[PDB]
Structure 1
């Protein structure tokens, strides 16, 4: 639905060689959206786009480390 995604497109907010923040941003967004939807009684499928983008750009060890930290309660980012 409005998808049919190949890869994360060019994001004018992160136009340079260092894409660390682009990955980070999309990871945060997906989890913030997933929280809001799971909370207020809604569907996580709206958070799809962010999941796809961060999946595409973020190294598996980063996502894995961040996931472990959110579970442990030590994720430094605001979700």
Structure 2
């Protein structure tokens, strides 16, 4: 339960002004993880880091649109 989370830290994978891919990657990372953790022996609490980062970084409308498209079956990223 390692937290003390304030906001998303600097990520050397995404060091420049354009942070779009950082939001996208953590959104994928969280949802890939949350799917994996529905296998036998899994709890979504392990996915929490990705969840906090994407929620911190991603515009609400991006999250909402992506969620809608995952439910429609039209999300274009691989989960």
TM-score normalised by length of structure 1: 0.97
Shift of 1:38: 1.2
Shift of 1:4: 1.2
Any stretches of 5+ residues in structure 1 without a counterpart?
none
How many angstroms apart in 2 are the aligned matches of 1:32 and 1:50? 10
Q: CA RMSD in A?
A: 0.7
Shift of 1:10: 0.1
Q: Give the 3-state SS of the residue equivalent to 1:2 in structure 2.
A: coil
- 1:12-45 CA-to-partner distances (Å, cap 9, x unmatched) read 0000000000000000000000000013431000
Give runs of aligned pairs for residues 1-79 of structure 1, distance below 5 A: 1-79=1-79
Q: Which stretches of structure 1, 4 residues or more, deviate above 6 A after TM superposition? A: none
How many angstroms apart in 2 are the aligned matches of 1:17 and 1:32? 26
User: Which shows bigger deviation, 35-44 or 68-77?
Assistant: 35-44
Any stretches of 5+ residues in structure 2 without a counterpart?
none
How many angstroms apart in 2 are the aligned matches of 1:30 and 1:40? 18
Alignment length, in residue pairs? 79
